[PDB]
C-alpha cells in the first residue's frame, strides 16, 4: 500500500508523505516489516507502541463566550461571535474543521455621522433638516438606546477649477452678485462631534450656511475619507455600529481628478483635520480612490449610505457595486425624506452578515459551508442574508495546508464585515517527528560514524549508503536481496536512478526533486490544466496535481467558492440549479443565464406561492409539518379582507383548494425592495 513504496527512509519523510502514514522507532529493530505504512500495522509486527509516532490534527477552543442576548449598555459583556480564539494543530499534509457563530445583538449602539453637501442647490435642503435631531432620536429610540449623532459638511476643494479667486469682492461673499450672502468655499469641515445630546445637532444646524459652487461634481470623497480615518475628531465608538450618511445633490469627483487643480499627491488615508476642524490638506491632497475608501471603511467598520437625489441615483447605485457594504437610496430635492431613508438603510445592512479573512497565510486555504435561518445548510459560500435582529447563524470552515513552510506558528482572524468581534485562529504545524532530540551524528552505532543516528536507521553521509551504512562508494557491492526492481524486465530504478548495495538512489535532476524507493515519483510532471502547469493552489507529487480546499478540481482549474452563484432574491441559483464550481448549472430545460433566472417557460410565481399561502393560512400538508414550506415565504405575509388591487404591477392569483372554497391572494414589491403579499381572510 501507500506509505510503504514512499517514505520509509526516515521518520520525517514518513510524516510528510501523507496524512494517514505513521512511524514506529523501537530500539528492537524488527526488520522484515515496514515502519511507515499505517498505525494498526505498527500496532502489530512487534514494534513498541510507545515508540509509535503518529501525530494527528487537533483543534480546541482557547477563548469562547456565549453569544449575547440583549446588549443594551453592557460595557464589554456584549458578544457577537461565540468562539473568539482557537488553537489549530495541523500535521503538515492534512486539514480539519471548526465552527463559527455570528449573531445580530438586539439594541446595539449606533453612531450616525451625517455628511452633507452644501452647494447652493442644497440651501432648501439645509432648511429641511433644522429639526432632524429630535426626529432621528424619536425614531431610533425603538431600534437602539445608545444613539450618537455627528455632523459634517463639504462642498469642494477651495482650489483651482472650483472657485480659484475672484477680482471682485466675491472672495468673502460669492453670493453678492446674486444679491444674497453665503460662506466662502470650503473643502471639508468637521462641525459636530458624535454626541448623545441630540438637541445640539439642531442647535448646530441653524448656524450652517451654503456656498456657491461652479455647479460641477462635488468633493464628497475627501469628506468621507476624513470622516472614516479621523478616529478621535469624529468620535467613533468601538463597540457600536457605524453608519456614515452621505447626502449629495450632484455628481462626484474621483481620484486623479485633482490633477486639473494642480494636485498630484495621492491621498494617504491619514487624518488631516486640525484644531480649526477644517481639512488642512484639502488644497494639497488628491481625492481618494475607491480601493482606498473601501479599505478604510472595512478597517474602521463603517457602513456607507449614499443619500442622493433621483437625478444621479443610477450613478451612485453603480458605484455601490464597487464598494461592498454601501446602501444607496432616494432623496427628495428638498431632502424631506432623509430620515425614512436612513432608517431603511440601517434596517437593511443589519439584515445580512458576511465573513472575511484577515492575515491568512499564503500556505493556508479555507473552505466554508454556511448555515442560514430555518436550519438550512448552503455549502460553498460564506455570506448569509435575509436575517432579522436577534437571529443567529453558523458556519463551518475547514483549513488545509499544502505542506508546512519555514515558520512553525502563525495566526489569522475570521471577522464579520461591519462587526467589532472576530475569531482569532492560531495555527501550528508538526513538521518534524519527536525523536530528533535523540539524534547522534557520527556515532559508533553507525558504522565508522559517517552520518547520523536518527531514532532508527542511520542516515549515511556523502559517500556512504545502505541501512546501517555498511556499504559505501569504496565497495559498491552488487549483491542485492531487497527486490530492487519495480517490475520484472523493467530497469532496477526505472532509469531515473541507480541501485547500490540493495537500495535505489536517484541521480541528478534539472527542475524538480525526485522521491521514492524506486525513483518512481517527482514533483515536476504533474498533470496540468490547459497543458501549462499545475495551477499552484495545491500539491504536486508523483504526477498528481492536488488542490487546496478553495481550489478543488481534477486539474485545480475551477474554484469551489459560491459567491457568484446566489440570486438577488437571497437563495442559490434562483432555486432551479446548483453551483458546480463557479457557474450555476440548472437541471431543467427552457432555462439559461448566469443563475438560470431567465426561464420563460417556467410558470407563474403564484404557482410556487400557493403552498406558502396554504401553510400560512391552514395547517395541512406534509410540507407544513416539515416546515420546509417556510423557505418559500420570503415576502411579507398579511391577512386582509379587502382586495388591494390598486397597484402599478400588483399581481393577483386564484387557487381552487381541496375544499369547495377558493383561496385569493395578491402580491407586489416596492422601491425599497421589500416585497409584500396579502391573503384574503376567508376563502371564496
Amino acid at each position: 500500500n501507500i506509505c510503504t513504496t514512499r517514505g520509509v527512509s526516515s521518520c520525517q519523510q514518513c510524516l510528510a508523505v501523507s496524512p494517514m502514514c505513521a512511524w514506529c522507532s523501537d530500539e528492537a529493530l524488527p526488520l522484515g516489516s515496514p515502519r511507515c505504512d499505517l498505525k494498526e500495522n505498527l500496532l502489530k509486527d512487534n514494534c513498541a507502541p510507545e515508540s509509535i509516532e503518529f501525530p494527528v490534527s487537533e483543534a480546541r477552543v482557547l477563548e469562547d463566550r456565549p453569544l449575547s442576548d440583549k446588549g443594551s449598555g453592557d460595557s464589554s459583556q456584549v458578544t457577537q461571535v461565540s468562539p473568539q480564539r482557537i488553537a489549530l494543530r495541523l500535521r503538515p499534509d492534512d486539514s480539519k474543521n471548526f465552527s463559527i457563530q455570528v449573531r445580530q445583538v438586539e439594541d446595539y449602539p449606533v453612531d450616525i455621522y451625517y455628511l452633507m453637501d452644501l452647494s447652493y442647490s442644497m440651501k432648501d435642503d439645509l432648511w429641511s433638516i433644522q429639526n432632524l435631531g429630535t426626529k432621528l432620536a424619536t425614531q431610533m429610540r425603538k431600534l437602539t438606546s445608545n444613539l450618537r449623532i455627528g455632523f459634517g459638511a463639504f462642498v469642494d476643494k477651495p482650489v483651482s477649477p472650483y472657485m480659484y479667486i475672484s477680482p471682485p469682492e466675491a472672495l468673502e461673499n460669492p453670493c453678492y452678485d446674486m444679491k444674497t450672502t453665503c460662506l466662502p468655499m470650503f473643502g471639508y469641515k468637521h462641525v459636530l462631534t458624535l454626541t448623545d445630546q441630540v438637541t445640539r445637532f439642531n442647535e448646530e444646524v441653524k448656524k450652517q450656511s451654503v456656498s456657491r459652487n461652479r455647479d460641477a461634481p462635488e468633493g464628497g470623497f475627501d469628506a468621507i475619507m476624513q470622516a472614516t480615518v479621523c478616529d478621535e475628531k469624529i468620535g467613533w465608538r468601538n463597540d457600536a455600529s457605524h453608519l456614515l450618511v452621505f447626502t449629495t445633490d450632484a455628481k462626484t469627483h474621483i481620484a486623479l481628478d485633482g490633477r486639473l487643480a494642480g494636485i498630484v499627491q495621492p491621498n494617504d488615508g491619514q487624518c488631516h483635520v486640525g484644531s480649526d476642524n477644517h481639512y488642512s490638506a484639502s488644497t494639497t491632497m488628491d481625492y481618494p480612490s475607491l480601493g482606498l475608501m473601501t479599505e478604510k471603511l472595512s478597517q474602521k467598520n463603517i457602513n456607507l449610505i449614499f443619500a442622493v437625489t433621483e437625478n444621479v441615483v443610477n450613478l451612485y447605485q453603480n458605484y455601490s457595486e464597487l464598494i461592498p457594504g454601501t446602501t444607496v437610496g432616494v432623496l427628495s430635492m428638498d431632502s424631506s425624506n432623509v430620515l425614512q431613508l436612513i432608517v431603511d438603510a440601517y434596517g437593511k445592512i443589519r439584515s445580512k452578515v458576511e465573513l472575511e479573512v484577515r492575515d491568512l497565510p499564503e500556505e493556508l486555504s479555507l473552505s466554508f459551508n454556511a448555515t442560514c435561518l430555518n436550519n438550512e445548510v448552503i455549502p460553498g459560500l460564506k455570506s448569509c442574508m435575509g436575517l432579522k435582529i436577534g437571529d443567529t447563524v453558523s458556519f463551518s470552515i475547514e483549513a488545509k495546508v499544502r505542506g508546512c513552510p519555514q515558520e512553525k506558528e502563525k495566526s489569522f482572524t475570521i471577522k464579520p464585515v461591519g462587526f467589532k468581534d472576530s475569531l482569532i485562529v492560531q495555527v501550528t504545524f508538526d513538521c518534524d517527528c519527536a525523536c530528533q532530540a535523540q539524534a547522534e551524528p557520527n556515532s559508533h552505532r553507525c558504522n565508522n560514524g559517517n552520518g547520523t543516528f536518527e531514532c532508527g536507521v542511520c542516515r549515511c553521509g556523502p559517500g556512504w549508503l545502505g541501512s546501517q551504512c555498511e556499504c559505501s562508494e569504496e565497495d559498491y557491492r552488487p549483491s542485492q536481496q531487497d527486490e530492487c526492481s519495480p517490475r520484472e524486465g523493467q530497469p532496477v530504478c526505472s532509469q531515473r536512478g541507480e541501485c547500490l548495495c540493495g537500495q535505489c538512489v536517484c541521480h541528478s535532476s534539472d527542475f524538480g526533486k525526485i522521491t521514492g524507493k524506486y525513483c518512481e515519483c517527482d514533483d515536476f510532471s504533474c498533470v496540468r490544466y490547459k497543458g501549462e502547469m499545475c495551477s499552484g493552489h495545491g500539491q504536486c507529487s508523483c504526477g498528481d496535481c492536488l488542490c487546496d480546499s478553495d481550489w478543488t478540481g481534477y486539474y485545480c482549474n475551477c474554484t469551489t467558492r459560491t459567491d457568484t452563484c446566489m440570486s438577488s432574491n437571497g437563495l442559490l441559483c434562483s432555486g432551479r440549479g446548483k453551483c458546480e464550481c463557479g457557474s450555476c448549472v440548472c437541471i431543467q430545460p427552457g432555462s439559461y443565464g448566469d443563475t438560470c433566472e431567465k426561464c420563460p417557460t417556467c410558470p407563474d410565481a403564484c404557482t410556487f406561492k400557493k403552498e406558502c399561502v396554504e401553510c400560512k393560512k391552514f395547517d395541512r400538508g406534509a410540507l407544513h409539518d416539515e416546515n420546509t414550506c417556510n423557505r418559500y415565504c420570503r415576502d411579507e405575509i398579511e391577512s386582509v379582507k379587502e382586495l388591494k388591487d390598486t397597484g402599478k404591477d400588483a399581481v393577483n392569483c386564484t387557487y381552487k383548494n381541496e375544499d369547495d372554497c377558493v383561496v385569493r391572494f395578491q402580491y407586489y414589491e416596492d422601491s425599497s425592495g421589500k416585497s409584500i403579499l396579502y391573503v384574503v381572510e376567508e376563502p371564496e
Binding site: 483651482s160 477649477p161 480659484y164 479667486i165 475672484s166 477680482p167 471682485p168 461652479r214 461634481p217 474621483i254 481620484a255 486623479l256 481628478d257 486639473l260 494642480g262 498630484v264 495621492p266 480612490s289 475607491l290 480601493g291 482606498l292 443610477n314 450613478l315 453603480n318 458605484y319 464597487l322 461592498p324 479573512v357 491568512l360 559517500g463 559498491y476 552488487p478 524486465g489 530497469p491 532509469q495 541507480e498 547500490l500 538512489v505 541521480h507 541528478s508 510532471s525 498533470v527 496540468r528 497543458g531 493552489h537 504526477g543 498528481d544 478553495d550 467558492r561 457568484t564 430545460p589 427552457g590 439559461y592 420563460p600 417557460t601 417556467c602 410558470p603 386564484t654 381552487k656 377558493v662
Partner: protein, 909 residues
C-alpha cells in the same frame, strides 16, 4: 530585459520644484548633441514678480551632467491698462507638459490665467510656448473671445500635447465648454507666422477643433491625454484622445480623423471610476504596419482569490486589423495600489528583435512605495503578458511619494548604440533617471558525438602514457554568436563540458582522454559573425572492472558564458545574452546492449489508435480522447519517441490519470517550425497502452471528417523511421432543437361588470390569458432555419372561446396568422371547433440560443355566461410544433428534426 540597471544616469533639480513631472528627448538637427527636457512646474524663476513660474531644463549627457533652464519667456505679467494686469503667471505650472519634435519644443502652462478683455476676470485658459530653432512664440488657442465657462475660458489648454508626422500640433484642454474637453490642432508654420505680441486673441485659418456638444457630454475631460496614430489608412495621423470621465465615468477614448476632425472610433471601459484613458499610447506592437492602441486604467479593480476586489490597474491592448476592427486583450496589474498603467511609454524595438516593445509604470509599487516599471516585449500575436524586466526605484520618500514612473519617454537612442533608451521621472524627489539599453547577443551552440553508441570491446585507441587500450569517441563543441547595434568585434566565452551529467558520490563512466576527469573548461574567442570555427576533443570509457551500470546513458553537458567586463565598451555598457536562447545543451550516449546482430540493434516499432468517439460534432467542449497502443516487436530501441501530429486547429489537454489499468506517461505538447505536435516517451518486445485527451473543432469547412497522424522516431541508426499511420473521426451536425411553452393555468365573473353593445377596452371583454413558447437549441451544433406552428381553437357553436389581442417576439423570427389580428379595434380542440393557425419562421440559433414567442388574448365572458346558463363545459386546449428545414453547414449532411407540445387552460365560474 536589457536595460542597464547597474549604472543609470542621475539628474536632480531644485528641491520641491517637481523636477521630472514631464520628460522628453530634445534631438535638434543643428548639432550632434541630444538633451533631456525635464519639466519643473514649481521651479522658482527670475521673472519680475513671478512666484512659482515653472521651468523646462535641458539636462545634458556625456558631460558634467547639469541642467540649465530654457529662457522661453523672461517677462512678467503684462498690463491691460493702468494698474490693470493682463496676465497672472504665478503658479502657472509651466513645464507641466513638454513635447519636442525635431528642433521644435512645445512646453505648456496648463494653469495660466489672464484678464479677459471684456471685463475684469481671472480665467485659466492655459498657454503654451513653442520654441522653433531661434524663434519663440506663444500659442494660446483657448484665449479667444469665448470667455465664460460655457466657452474656452476655463480651457486649460496645454494639459496634454503631441506633435504629428505632418508637423501639426495637437493640444487637449479638459475644461472647454463646461469641462467637456476639446482638441485643438494647428499647423506649426501657421502658429509661428501668425504671432503678434500685441494681439491677444489670434485667428488661425487652418484650425481643426472639436466643437461644443449637448449638455449630457459635460464633465468629460476630453483631452486628458492625447496620442497620434493612423487608423483609417489615409497616411495622415489621426487623433487619439482620452475622455476619462465619459459614459458615466466609465472612461472612453475617442479617435478623430486627422484631416477634418470627424469621429472615427470609440473605446469604452468596463469599470467606473477607473480612469480608462488616463494614459493613451499608439504604436505597432506586432509589426503589421498598423498602429495599435494601449489605454491605461490605473485604478482598475479586479477580482482575485477569495472574491476580493484588488486595485491593481489595467491596460487594454487593441490590435488594428485591416477589416477596420480591433482585437482587444487586457493586461492586469501586479501589486495593489501601485496604479499600474499610470504611464505608458512606447520604446520602439528595445532589443531589435523585429517587434516593437513597450513600458508601463506602477508609480506607487515595488519595495516600499517608491515605484517600479515593467518592460514588455511585442510578439507576432501582440504583447507578451510577462514583463521581461523590472526597473525598481531607489529613493527614500519624503513629504510626498517619490512617484517613480509618473512620466517616461522612449524610442530615442540617447547613447547612439543602436538600442533605444528610456527616461523615468521621479518628481516626488525632484529627480530624473536615464536607463540605457545594452546590446542583446544571440548564441547558437552545437554538441554531437560521432558514434553515439559504444561497443565496449572497441578498444581501438590507447590511453597516452601507457600501453592499455580503451574504447573512445569524440565530442564536438561549436559556438556561433551575433547581435545588432554597436558591439565589439571579438567576444570571450568560457565553455565547460561535463562528460557525465546525471551522475554525481557515484563513480563516472566516461573520462577525458587527455585527462582523468569528467569536466573540461576552455576559453575561446568568438567573432560577431564569421563561422562556427570550432574544435573537437576525445573521450573514453573506463574498463568494465570499474563499474557495472551499463543501462544508464552517459550524458554530455555544455554550459557557456561570456565575460561581460571585456565587452563593456567605453561607457561601461556591457552586453547581455538573448533571453530565450538556452545556455545549457545536452546529448546522450549508450553502451551496446548485447544485441550482437551487426554490432548494433534493430528494433521494429508499430502503433495503433482507436477511440469511442467514432463521430464528433462541429463545436463544443470537446471531450475527445484517444487510446493508443505502442509495440516494439524488434530489438530494444534507444530514446524511442512517439509523435502525434494534428491538422490546423486542435488542442491538447493532457494524459489521462487515475487509470491504473491504462499505462500512464509524461506526454508533452510542443509547437515549432509552424508545426504543432504532442511528443511522448525501450526494451525489446515492449507493449504499452496509453490514453490521451484532445480538443478538436472544425475551422476549414471543406471536409466532413478530421484526421490524426502518428509517428515513431528513435536514436537507432537503421530503424530511424517507423511507417506512418493515420486515424479518422467523422464530423456530425447535432443541432438538438426543442419547443416548450405554458399557458395563466386556470381562470375564474368580473366584479362590477355590465353588458355593453360593443367592447372598447380590454376589461370590457374579460380577463387576459397568456401563452408563452420558446424554441431553443440545446445541441452542440447550430441550425440555419426552422418553422413552427401553433394550433388554437377560436370559435365554437357561434361562441367566441378566446380573442387574440397582440403578438410579441424575441429573436430573429417573423410570424404570420391565417386570420385577422384583433378584428375589433380594442384599445374542445380544433377537432370539434373552429380553428386558427399561427405559422412562424425563425432564423439561425446557436447552442443555448432561443427564440421566444408571447401571446396575449381576451376571454369573452358572454360565452361562458351562456355556458353557465346552458349547463355545460368547455375542454379548452391548444397545441404547437416545429420542424427544422436548413442547417448553415452546406457541405455537411442535413437531418430532419420535428417535434410538438400541448397546452391547456381551465375556466370556471
Amino acid at each position: 530585459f536589457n536595460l542597464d540597471v547597474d549604472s543609470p544616469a542621475e539628474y536632480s533639480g531644485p528641491e520641491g520644484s517637481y523636477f521630472g513631472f514631464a520628460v522628453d528627448f530634445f534631438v535638434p538637427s543643428a548639432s550632434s548633441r541630444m538633451f533631456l527636457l525635464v519639466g519643473a512646474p514649481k521651479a522658482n524663476t527670475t521673472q519680475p514678480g513671478i512666484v512659482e513660474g515653472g521651468q523646462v531644463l535641458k539636462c545634458d549627457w556625456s558631460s558634467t551632467r547639469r541642467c540649465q533652464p530654457i529662457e522661453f519667456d523672461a517677462t512678467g505679467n503684462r498690463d491691460y491698462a493702468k494698474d490693470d494686469p493682463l496676465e497672472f503667471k504665478s503658479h502657472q505650472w509651466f513645464g507641466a507638459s513638454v513635447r519636442s519634435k525635431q528642433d521644435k519644443i512645445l512646453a505648456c502652462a496648463p494653469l495660466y490665467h489672464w484678464r479677459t478683455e471684456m471685463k475684469q476676470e481671472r480665467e485659466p485658459v492655459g498657454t503654451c510656448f513653442l520654441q522653433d530653432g531661434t524663434k519663440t512664440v506663444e500659442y494660446a488657442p483657448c484665449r479667444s473671445q469665448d470667455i465664460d465657462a460655457d466657452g474656452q475660458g476655463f480651457c486649460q489648454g496645454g494639459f496634454s500635447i503631441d506633435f504629428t508626422k505632418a508637423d501639426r500640433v495637437l493640444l487637449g484642454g479638459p475644461g472647454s465648454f463646461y469641462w467637456q474637453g476639446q482638441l485643438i490642432s494647428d499647423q506649426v508654420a501657421e502658429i509661428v507666422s501668425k504671432y503678434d505680441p500685441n494681439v491677444y486673441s489670434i485667428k488661425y485659418n487652418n484650425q481643426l477643433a472639436t466643437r461644443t456638444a449637448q449638455a449630457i457630454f459635460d464633465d468629460s475631460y476630453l483631452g486628458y491625454s492625447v496620442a497620434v496614430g493612423d487608423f483609417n489608412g489615409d497616411g495622415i495621423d489621426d487623433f487619439v484622445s482620452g475622455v476619462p470621465r465619459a459614459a458615466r465615468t466609465l472612461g472612453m477614448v475617442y479617435i478623430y480623423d486627422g484631416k477634418n476632425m470627424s469621429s472615427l472610433y470609440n473605446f469604452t471601459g468596463e469599470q467606473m471610476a477607473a480612469y480608462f484613458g488616463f494614459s493613451v499610447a499608439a504604436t505597432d506592437i506586432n509589426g503589421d504596419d498598423y498602429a495599435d492602441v494601449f489605454i491605461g486604467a490605473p485604478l482598475f479593480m479586479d477580482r482575485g482569490s477569495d472574491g476580493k476586489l484588488q486595485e491593481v490597474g489595467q491596460v487594454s491592448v487593441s490590435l488594428q486589423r485591416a477589416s477596420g476592427d480591433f482585437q482587444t486583450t487586457k493586461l492586469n496589474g501586479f501589486e495593489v495600489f501601485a496604479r499600474f498603467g499610470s504611464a505608458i511609454a512606447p520604446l520602439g524595438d528595445l532589443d531589435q528583435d523585429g517587434f516593437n516593445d513597450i513600458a508601463i509604470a506602477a508609480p506607487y509599487g515595488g519595495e516600499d512605495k517608491k515605484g517600479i516599471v515593467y518592460i514588455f516585449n511585442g510578439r507576432s500575436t501582440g504583447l507578451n503578458a510577462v514583463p521581461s524586466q523590472i526597473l525598481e526605484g531607489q529613493w527614500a520618500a519624503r513629504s510626498m511619494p517619490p512617484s517613480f514612473g509618473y512620466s517616461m519617454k522612449g524610442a530615442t537612442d540617447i547613447d547612439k548604440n543602436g538600442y533605444p533608451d528610456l527616461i523615468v521621472g521621479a518628481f516626488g524627489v525632484d529627480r530624473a533617471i536615464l536607463y540605457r539599453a545594452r546590446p542583446v547577443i544571440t548564441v547558437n551552440a552545437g554538441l554531437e558525438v560521432y558514434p553515439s553508441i559504444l561497443n565496449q570491446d572497441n578498444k581501438t585507441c590507447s590511453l597516452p602514457g601507457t600501453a592499455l587500450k580503451v574504447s573512445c569517441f569524440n565530442v564536438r563543441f561549436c559556438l556561433k554568436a551575433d547581435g545588432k547595434g554597436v558591439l565589439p568585434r571579438k567576444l570571450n566565452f568560457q565553455v565547460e563540458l561535463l562528460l557525465d551529467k546525471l551522475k554525481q558520490g557515484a563513480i563516472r563512466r566516461a573520462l577525458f582522454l587527455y585527462s582523468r576527469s569528467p569536466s573540461h573548461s576552455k576559453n575561446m574567442t568568438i567573432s560577431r559573425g564569421g563561422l562556427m570555427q570550432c574544435e573537437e576533443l576525445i573521450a573514453y570509457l573506463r574498463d568494465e572492472s570499474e563499474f557495472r551500470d551499463k543501462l544508464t546513458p552517459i550524458t554530455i553537458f555544455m554550459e557557456y558564458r561570456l565575460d561581460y567586463r571585456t565587452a563593456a565598451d567605453t561607457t561601461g555598457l556591457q552586453p547581455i545574452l538573448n533571453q530565450f536562447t538556452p545556455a545549457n545543451i545536452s546529448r546522450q550516449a549508450h553502451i551496446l546492449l548485447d544485441c550482437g546482430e551487426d554490432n548494433v540493434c534493430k528494433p521494429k516499432l508499430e502503433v495503433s489508435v482507436d477511440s469511442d468517439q467514432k463521430k464528433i460534432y462541429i463545436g463544443d467542449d470537446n471531450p475527445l480522447t484517444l487510446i493508443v497502443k505502442a509495440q516494439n516487436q524488434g530489438e530494444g530501441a534507444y530514446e524511442a519517441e512517439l509523435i502525434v501530429s494534428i491538422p490546423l486547429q486542435a488542442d491538447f489537454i493532457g494524459v489521462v490519470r487515475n487509470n491504473e489499468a491504462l499505462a500512464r506517461l509524461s506526454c508533452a505538447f510542443k509547437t515549432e517550425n509552424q508545426t504543432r505536435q504532442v511528443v511522448c516517451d525501450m526494451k525489446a518486445g515492449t507493449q504499452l497502452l496509453a490514453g490521451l485527451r484532445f480538443s478538436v473543432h472544425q475551422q476549414s469547412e471543406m471536409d466532413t471528417s478530421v484526421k490524426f497522424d502518428l509517428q515513431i522516431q528513435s536514436s537507432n541508426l537503421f530503424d530511424k523511421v517507423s511507417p506512418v499511420v493515420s486515424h479518422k473521426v467523422d464530423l456530425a451536425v447535432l443541432a438538438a432543437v426543442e419547443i416548450r411553452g405554458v399557458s395563466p393555468d386556470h381562470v375564474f365573473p368580473i366584479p362590477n361588470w355590465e353588458h355593453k353593445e360593443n367592447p372598447e377596452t380590454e376589461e370590457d371583454v374579460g380577463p387576459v390569458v397568456q401563452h408563452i413558447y420558446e424554441l431553443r437549441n440545446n445541441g452542440p451544433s447550430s441550425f440555419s432555419k426552422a418553422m413552427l406552428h401553433l394550433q388554437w381553437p377560436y370559435k365554437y357553436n357561434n361562441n367566441t372561446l378566446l380573442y387574440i389581442l397582440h403578438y410579441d417576439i424575441d429573436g430573429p423570427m417573423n410570424c404570420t396568422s391565417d386570420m385577422e389580428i384583433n378584428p375589433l379595434r380594442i384599445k374542445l380542440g380544433c377537432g370539434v371547433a373552429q380553428c386558427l393557425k399561427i405559422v412562424c419562421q425563425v432564423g439561425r440559433l446557436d447552442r443555448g440560443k432561443s427564440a421566444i414567442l408571447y401571446v396575449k388574448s381576451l376571454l369573452w365572458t358572454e360565452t361562458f355566461m351562456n355556458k353557465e346558463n346552458q349547463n355545460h363545459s368547455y375542454s379548452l386546449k391548444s397545441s404547437a410544433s416545429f420542424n427544422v428545414i436548413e442547417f448553415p453547414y452546406k457541405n455537411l449532411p442535413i437531418e430532419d428534426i420535428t417535434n410538438s407540445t400541448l397546452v391547456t387552460t381551465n375556466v370556471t365560474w
